[PDB]
Nucleic acid binder design. Structure first.
Lengths: 143, 136, 246, 48, 198, 48, 184, 97, 233, 245, 184
RNA sequence: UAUUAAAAAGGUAUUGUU
């Protein structure tokens, strides 16, 4: 047809008796409800009620997997620094004499690399939302 | 008491399909149209003559996962490969050329002929590979 | 059921002495680990089920111990036949699958990774202890001819004596209804088809006069029924003959 | 689009344009499998 | 699996091979030109800046004399195309069409390679770039200028030409989006209008 | 495209049209049609 | 009174506190010493321990040694929380594995990008781009590559920092490492 | 029977969502029932009528009644359709039959 | 120019069945499985590493042989193998007589340091993040025993250890005058925060102290009596 | 409300026959916002977008059929082709749902001893998809699902090409796969047109950004009047003008 | 309906059918870019790894010899299943066979009874490391549950793909530099 | 409002912590 069948022009479509006695549920699901996101208690990205849920419990460590903000090593400029025990112990804050060229050479790849890993994790959420997330419709199992 | 966020509108995970099974619409349109006060959809005029298959029960009722319910969605040469990567791909590099006889195939046939002629497993392996390399 | 230990539900289709699967004092179900192979940790394992689906293959027949001749007893068959998928050397339906509450009841401790009444009554040991020490300068029982009794059913056409005829990986002849008082004929009707299987292997399907008089009538009793589109007439050689109709 | 005028027009045009008879390969053109004019090969040939 | 005959640890200091392959050409060239790589024949031709096709065709009809006239040009194009990506031209395309057509119905069971070729045949039509444009329009890769050029191409039409180029039913979408088609398929900005000078 | 509001005037001059007709011809390949594109470049008052 | 050495007042310190036994070589901890590591010559003990502590942290062994040693919880709550952790770990293993099973697809896309570069730029060219040392015909420059790659392969001591241990007011847990309040 | 249920589009904003039940039937065989929730009387009526024409049901009236006791269980209401000599059921249920 | 026809005495080298063999041998060596899609530099490094370093009884016999397929897949050592892989004290401290065994007792709200000698002679009292101040009338209990105060106090402990322990060596009779470090065994009761930097403080003093062995002794509770109730249970 | 006009005879057919290429006329109406007396409007663009995405249902379906149905018989055989034609024909024209129609497809009757014929032709069961997609393009070009023919094939082809990049690019969670109660946002639909329009926004708000919610060059559908308008002047005024010819 | 591995609702794969790389790459194929395509060859049918547990709860670990060498006088083979402190690795972590766990608890707590294993610790740790499978250093066991490892590898091989791309774009920069420097 | 490249949370109240 021309529209999706899980919504009506007034909200979500009531299916069972619960929906018909409590029709708040059809038009309100958190401080981030929007008429496009109706009922779907995952709503947009970044807004409230957006987290994908893996079998009931919701997901909030999406970067903490890739290693952004979880276990930040990235090693590309890190090995460079740890190497330069001269320009690590100098006034540690110059384009100092020689090695701060190589420090920024490593970091130039760090930047592109972490942009690629971040886009990876963005596509990861946008995949795991398709083909794993129950959308919080199944009961918790983390307890 | 924290219940699952979207739980309230969850679907009944076992009986959410059954509304949609083609047999339900066959049973439910057969009478709607038998009444004589209805103009059957064009799909009924057809899937009446070709009713769906009988035994494609959903796994949600046949509580058996190992059961190949649907006939459509159904599903040695390991070493003939690990010994020659040209033997594998000889019709299948870009898209399995599924109508030309294949070297992996004829080497399986050769293998069995040899092992019934009585050559041990390992030696039929070598003789198959050497006969392939030769014909190459 | 929302009580714990009642989630197992009503399983009439088990084998147990109850229908209330939560009252069966026998096989307490491990809930976290099972289910990889059977659906849910409730349902019985696919090696103990008493009711079989359509496209799902039912149990395999435990062959004789050595399992050299389970392919030699299809020497009558097409030369190149593979191992039969419905045959098994070690199919035991009293094989207790491992449960964590049954055999590793961690209830009475801190559940600290080392504690637990691990019961080694169920799993076949992996130790070299056994195959090292229980090695003998004599031979094995299969040579000693220790074993009386052979096969429990006596003389089975796939394991003891050679299998003649065709294999029946369905049950199209097993679920066959006798259309004759002497049972020389058996029947198997679908909805629009009718399968008439001469059941007479002890005489190589050689029809007696009486049996042919009964068959002349069951054949046309089926090819005159109104819901008969096709009549598959054939021989139900139970593994005892290669003959269609002598 | 159209609530069915074009539907029933296409359908009458179809049933009046359906070809019947055996063709040079041994099948009514709507036999289950034996396709004719595959990729317009018959008008290809008749041009060429 | 590592494909057949494709050597992995092959270097340049590894001696040069003999097989006329795309890989062989590309690695020999890596030795030869040092670092020049062209995204097509026409990147090389924009680098050469005015050397036409015949301007190398004659060079090679001379360089190796047992070659015939057009065959010299062919060696030209082929070494280009083999150190590049093969070219999109009505020449190669009419070759493919005329040839597959003289080839005819095939012996793959379900006319399979014929259907592969025909799914290719209509993939390089205008209608494909027309619909590719319509699809991109549904995605908003464009800007105000694009909108305006579309509008004005519509304006330049007439009643008669609308009535005409509607009978193809994609013709008019191309008449309108024609500049947008050339954009979405053409990785180039004809427009960098430097500075107004009054 | 001509200017129809004094905004397009700001991105507009014939001497700039020159660099662009040159894009036209440098990308053009045959002289029988460089003929018509040069005909237009001279007919629209492009400051050659 | 008599405390186990994992109790808070283990080695009391005051006028009256007494520690039993000798403490040299063979100490009271002769059979109670978990992790000794012989120092290599000159190696930094700020590395030996900055590795020991990370291992005994990832192995959540310090989790437990802090936890059970402070407040002897109810077996019910100890089970509750330990089971809770086995279960939440069993959950996040589901997530980690979806991530891994995705990143291997992403990595296959990386390697297939590699094989588009390889089939437009040539495999040996690609090897040079990776550093296939063709212009270096000199075993000396080969030795230079040798040495740099081996000084890099013998990765220097990586100093993994162990997140600090937090003390909230009544010390609701001494598994506390960040200021999240946990389910007690 | 119409009703009224308060709908809370927000903590501060509440609407009166009238909730209709209705059954669109013709004893010629075909009858569905739809219940709806919508802010207004006529809009809830229309919504329920479209839900009913979605839930349309028919009946093989060749037997002009059930020929065996149908003991069903709707959403909490244990129903039993049985054969009688004549329609013997509630005023409402009887007008439905 | 480079005419094709000229180079021939090489172009029949191919169609000679001698080079057919010498190149089909290569093609066969190549058809095998390979686990390197491009030129890996660490694979090249591994190759060159060993390049630098280096600078019949048929089936019947083993059929009667019993322990064969056990020694085939055995993971235990085969042939004459070491005893440093069996002896109890392999990876164990080989102490001396003349060593100071310095304890780092880092508790939760205070982290003190002590030393003893191999006989258990206390060389000085328990220098404490409360005994040197740092603990009372301060920013709070939250930093009662963090890394900074522990480092400060172990630095103060070494401050006295150096003169004290050289005094004891003169007292017993080892005229260990100069250049010879103090042989230190660092016994660390830890997992807290006052140990993480205290280790740095003992490391700053390797220019006087050769730390021999570095061990942690944090007793673990297997089954020991109650610990004082917390707030919840 | 998406209420289609209830048709009639001559009069509705006059209004309906004199329609002409609605997709184009929508485009005309969208661009004409580039003329002097009009502005290019998102409402016009969205009427264009829906007049072009009208056949979303049939397209997402037939793509699912071609590419998610391991071993779909011989689709080029007129039997399964007729199953396909009749199902997709009733997937458009709304008489069937996507989910139920797909079940009708994967359940229609094909050939006896189906697994046994399959395990002879297919190793892992999942056949070649070219017969399938050729069948589906034939489907939508025999049924005039599109006014401009090449469009059918193009969408059928490109949606498939785009999905070919995803991880598990050919599995669909049966719930979200087609219509049901709870669905996915159209950027995340499977063979949909927005899945390539996948992006997001980027915001640097003023110190005072929520207050000025009208001050910018904002299009007003509902114009402010002094009763709600505190000091706002209008979307045309410019207090800080730059000199220019 | 959930899968077992982590709870997926689909069948984890990369390519199903024989064509789906060809159909994806058709126009390249009709212009003839897919005759030499090794990007359509290496990865025409690359399917994901055995990202699962072949024997989850560890019925096959250890190896049969290890049992017979798991006795009380065998701290050497004990300590190759205990933590650096003597702790067992929890069953979620090092899934052992139940018989192994039984023999191991009794073997450790009998060796500790007769004082032939340290009442706390792991005396055979580094010797034991040779048997314990060093995994997250260089080799990528695709069935790991560490995702930091997988991301190192996705980077490092994406590092190298970007390295091909960098080397060749800077060579093209060099070429356009040599253009004006050699002809003018 | 429990430091993700902004993201997960309860009510005995039913305009609902005055």
């Amino acid at each position: 047809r021309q529209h999706d069948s899980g919504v009506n022009q007034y909200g979500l479509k009531p299916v069972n008796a619960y929906d018909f006695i409590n029709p708040t549920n059809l038009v309100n699901f958190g401080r981030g409800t929007s008429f496009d996101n109706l009922g779907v208690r995952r709503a947009g990205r970044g807004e409230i009620d957006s987290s994908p849920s893996l079998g009931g419990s919701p997901v909030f460590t999406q970067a903490k997997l890739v290693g952004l903000s979880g276990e930040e090593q990235l090693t590309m400029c890190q090995s460079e620094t740890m190497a330069l025990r001269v320009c690590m112990a100098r006034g540690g804050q110059d384009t100092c004499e020689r090695e701060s060229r190589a420090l920024d050479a490593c970091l130039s790849r760090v930047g592109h690399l972490r942009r690629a890993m971040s886009e990876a994790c963005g596509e990861f959420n946008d995949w795991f939302i398709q083909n794993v997330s129950d959308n919080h419709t199944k009961p918790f199992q983390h307890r | 008491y924290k219940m699952p966020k979207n739980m309230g509108v969850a679907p009944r995970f076992d009986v959410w399909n059954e509304s949609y099974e083609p047999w339900q619409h066959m049973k439910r349109m057969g009478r709607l149209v038998g009444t004589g006060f209805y103009i059957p959809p064009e799909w009924y005029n057809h899937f009446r003559m070709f009713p769906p298959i009988n035994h494609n029960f959903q796994q949600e009722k046949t509580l058996n996962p190992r059961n190949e319910s649907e006939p459509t969605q159904d599903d040695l040469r390991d070493e003939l490969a690990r010994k020659s990567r040209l033997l594998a791909s000889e019709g299948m590099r870009y898209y399995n050329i599924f109508w030309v006889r294949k070297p992996l195939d004829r080497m399986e046939k050769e293998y069995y002929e040899l092992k019934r002629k009585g050559i041990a497993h390992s030696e039929a392996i070598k003789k198959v590979l050497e006969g392939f390399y030769k014909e190459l | 059921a929302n009580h714990p230990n009642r989630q197992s539900g009503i399983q009439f289709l088990t084998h147990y002495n109850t229908h209330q699967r939560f009252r069966v004092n026998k096989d307490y179900i491990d809930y976290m680990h099972w289910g990889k192979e059977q659906g849910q940790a409730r349902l019985p394992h696919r090696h103990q089920r008493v009711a079989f689906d359509f496209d799902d293959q039912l149990h395999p027949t435990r062959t004789l111990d050595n399992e050299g001749d389970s392919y030699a007893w299809c020497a009558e068959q097409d030369p190149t036949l593979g191992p039969h998928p419905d045959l098994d050397a070690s199919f035991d339906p009293n094989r207790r699958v491992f449960s964590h509450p049954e055999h590793w009841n961690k209830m009475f401790s801190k559940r600290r990774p080392g504690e637990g009444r691990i019961d080694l009554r169920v799993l076949p040991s992996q130790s070299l202890l056994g195959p090292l020490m229980e090695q003998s300068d004599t031979q094995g029982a299969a040579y000693f001819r220790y074993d009386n009794r052979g096969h429990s059913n006596g003389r089975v056409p796939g394991l003891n004596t050679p299998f003649f005829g065709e294999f029946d990986r369905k049950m199209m002849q097993a679920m066959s209804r006798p259309l004759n008082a002497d049972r020389t004929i058996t029947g198997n009707d679908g909805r629009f088809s009718k399968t008439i299987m001469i059941n007479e292997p002890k005489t190589h399907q050689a029809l007696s006069g009486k049996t042919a008089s009964e068959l002349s009538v069951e054949i046309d009793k089926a090819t005159n029924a109104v819901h008969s589109k096709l009549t598959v007439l054939e021989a139900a050689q139970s593994g005892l003959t290669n003959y269609y109709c002598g | 689009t159209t609530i069915g005028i074009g539907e029933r027009i296409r359908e009458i045009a179809e049933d009046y344009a359906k070809g019947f008879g055996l063709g040079p390969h041994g099948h009514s053109p709507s036999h289950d499998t034996c396709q004719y004019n595959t990729l317009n090969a018959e008008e290809d040939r008749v041009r060429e | 699996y590592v494909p057949a005959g494709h050597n992995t640890l092959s270097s340049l200091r590894h001696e040069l091979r003999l097989e006329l392959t795309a890989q062989s050409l590309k690695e020999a060239w890596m030795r030869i030109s040092g670092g020049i790589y062209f995204q097509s024949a026409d990147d090389y031709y924009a680098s050469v800046d005015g050397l036409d096709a015949e301007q190398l065709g004659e060079v090679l009809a001379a360089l190796f004399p047992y070659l015939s006239t057009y065959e010299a040009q062919a060696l030209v194009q082929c070494t280009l195309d083999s150190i590049s990506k093969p070219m999109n031209t009505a020449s190669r395309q009419l070759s493919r069409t005329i040839t597959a057509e003289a080839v005819g119905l095939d012996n793959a069971p379900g006319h399979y390679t014929n259907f592969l070729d025909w799914m290719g045949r209509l993939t390089e039509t205008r209608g494909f770039k027309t619909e590719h444009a319509l699809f991109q329009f549904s995605r908003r890769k464009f800007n105000r200028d694009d909108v305006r050029v579309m509008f004005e191409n519509y304006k330049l039409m007439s009643r008669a030409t609308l009535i005409a180029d509607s009978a193809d039913s994609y013709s008019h979408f191309y008449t309108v989006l024609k500049d947008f088609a050339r954009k979405v398929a053409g990785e180039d900005s004809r427009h960098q209008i430097g500075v107004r000078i009054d | 495209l001509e200017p129809r509001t004094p905004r397009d005037w700001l991105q507009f001059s014939y001497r700039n049209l020159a660099y662009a007709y040159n894009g036209a011809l440098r990308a053009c390949q045959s002289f029988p049609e460089m003929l018509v594109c040069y005909k237009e470049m001279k007919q629209r008052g492009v400051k050659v | 009174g008599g405390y186990m050495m994992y109790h808070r007042k283990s080695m009391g310190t005051m006028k009256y506190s007494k520690w039993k036994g000798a403490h040299g070589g063979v100490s009271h901890f002769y059979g109670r010493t978990p992790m000794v590591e012989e120092v290599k010559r000159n190696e930094p003990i700020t590395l030996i321990d900055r590795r020991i502590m990370h291992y005994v942290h990832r192995s959540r062994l310090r989790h437990f040694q802090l936890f059970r040693s402070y407040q002897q919880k109810s077996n019910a709550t100890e089970c509750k929380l330990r089971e809770g952790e086995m279960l939440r770990r069993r959950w996040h293993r589901k997530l980690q594995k979806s991530f891994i099973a995705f990143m291997q697809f992403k990595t296959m896309k990386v390697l297939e990008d590699q094989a588009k570069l390889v089939n437009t730029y040539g495999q040996a060219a690609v090897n040079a781009a990776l550093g296939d040392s063709w212009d270096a015909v000199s075993d000396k420059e080969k030795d230079r590559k040798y040495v740099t790659i081996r000084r890099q392969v013998k990765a220097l001591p990586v100093v993994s920092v162990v997140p600090k241990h937090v003390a909230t007011m009544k010390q609701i847990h001494n598994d506390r490492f960040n200021y999240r309040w946990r389910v007690n | 029977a119409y009703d009224m249920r308060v709908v809370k589009f927000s903590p501060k904003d509440h609407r009166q969502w009238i909730y209709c039940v209705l059954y669109v039937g013709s004893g010629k065989g075909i009858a569905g029932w739809g219940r709806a929730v919508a802010p207004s009387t006529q809009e809830a009526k229309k919504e329920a009528i479209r839900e009913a024409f979605s839930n349309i049901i028919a009946v093989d009236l060749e037997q002009e009644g059930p020929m065996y006791p149908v003991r069903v269980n709707a959403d909490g209401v244990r129903v039993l359709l049985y054969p009688a000599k004549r329609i013997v059921a509630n005023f409402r249920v009887a007008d439905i039959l | 120019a480079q005419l094709p026809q000229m180079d021939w005495e090489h172009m029949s080298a191919r169609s000679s069945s001698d080079a057919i063999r010498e190149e089909m041998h290569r093609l066969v060596e190549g058809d095998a499985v390979q686990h390197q899609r491009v030129f890996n530099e660490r694979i090249w490094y591994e190759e060159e590493e060993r390049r630098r370093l280096q600078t019949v009884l048929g089936n019947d016999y083993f059929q009667s042989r019993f322990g064969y397929s056990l020694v085939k897949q055995s993971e235990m050592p085969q042939g004459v193998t070491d005893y440093n892989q069996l002896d109890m004290w392999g990876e164990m401290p080989k102490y001396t007589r003349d060593m100071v065994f310095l304890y780092l007792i880092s508790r939760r709200r205070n982290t003190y340091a002590v030393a003893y000698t191999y006989e258990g002679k206390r060389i000085l009292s328990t220098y404490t993040a409360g005994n040197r101040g740092l603990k009372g009338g301060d920013r709070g209990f939250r930093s009662d025993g963090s890394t900074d105060n522990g480092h400060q106090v172990t630095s103060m402990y070494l401050n006295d250890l150096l003169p004290k322990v050289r005094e004891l060596r003169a007292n017993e009779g080892r005229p260990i005058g100069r250049g010879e470090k103090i042989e230190l065994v660092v016994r660390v009761m830890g997992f807290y925060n006052g140990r993480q930097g205290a280790v740095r403080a003992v490391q700053d003093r390797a220019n006087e102290f050769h730390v021999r062995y570095f061990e942690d002794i944090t007793p673990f509770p297997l089954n020991g009596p109650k610990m004082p109730r917390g707030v919840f249970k | 409300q998406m209420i289609p006009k209830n048709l009639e005879g001559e009069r509705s057919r006059r209004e309906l026959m004199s329609r002409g290429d609605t997709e184009f006329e929508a485009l005309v109406e969208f661009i004409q916002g580039a003329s002097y007396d009009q502005l290019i409007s998102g409402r016009r663009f969205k009427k264009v977008y829906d007049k072009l995405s009208e056949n979303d249902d049939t397209f997402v379906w037939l793509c699912h059929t071609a590419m998610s149905v391991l071993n779909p018989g011989d689709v080029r055989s007129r039997l399964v082709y007729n199953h396909l034609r009749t199902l997709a024909e009733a997937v458009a024209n709304g008489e069937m749902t996507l989910r139920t129609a797909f079940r009708f497809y994967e359940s229609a009757v094909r050939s006896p001893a189906y697994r046994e014929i399959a395990k002879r032709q297919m190793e892992g069961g999942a056949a070649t998809r070219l017969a399938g997609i050729s069948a589906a393009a034939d489907v939508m070009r025999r049924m005039g699902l599109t006014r401009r023919p090449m469009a059918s094939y193009f969408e059928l082809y490109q949606r498939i090409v785009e999905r070919s990049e995803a991880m598990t690019p050919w599995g669909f969670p049966p719930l979200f796969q087609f219509e049901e109660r709870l669905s996915l946002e159209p950027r995340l639909k499977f063979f949909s047109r927005a899945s390539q329009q996948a992006l997001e926004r980027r915001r640097r708000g003023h110190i005072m950004s929520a207050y000025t919610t009208l001050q910018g060059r904002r299009i007003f559908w509902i114009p402010p009047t002094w009763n709600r308008a505190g000091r706002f002047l209008g979307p045309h005024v410019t207090l800080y003008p730059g000199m220019t010819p | 309906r959930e899968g077992w591995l982590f709870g997926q609702q689909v069948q984890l794969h990369y390519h199903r059918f024989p064509d789906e790389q060809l159909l994806t790459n058709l126009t390249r194929w009709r212009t003839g870019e897919t005759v030499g395509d090794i990007a359509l060859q290496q990865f025409r049918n690359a399917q994901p790894f055995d990202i699962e547990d072949k024997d989850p709860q560890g019925m096959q670990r250890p190896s049969p010899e290890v049992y017979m060498k798991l006795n009380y006088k065998n701290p050497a083979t004990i300590s190759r299943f205990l933590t650096r402190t003597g702790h067992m690795y929890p069953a979620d972590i090092l899934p052992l066979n139940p018989e192994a766990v039984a023999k191991l608890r009794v073997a450790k707590a009998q060796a500790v009874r007769i004082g032939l294993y340290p009442r706390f610790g792991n005396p055979f740790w580094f010797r034991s490391q040779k048997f314990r499978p060093k995994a997250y250093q260089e080799n990528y066991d695709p069935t790991t549950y560490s995702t930091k490892h997988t991301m190192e590898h996705f980077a490092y091989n994406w590092v190298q793909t970007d390295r091909i791309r960098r080397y060749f774009k800077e060579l093209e920069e060099l070429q356009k530099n040599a253009s004006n420097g050699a002809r003018g």
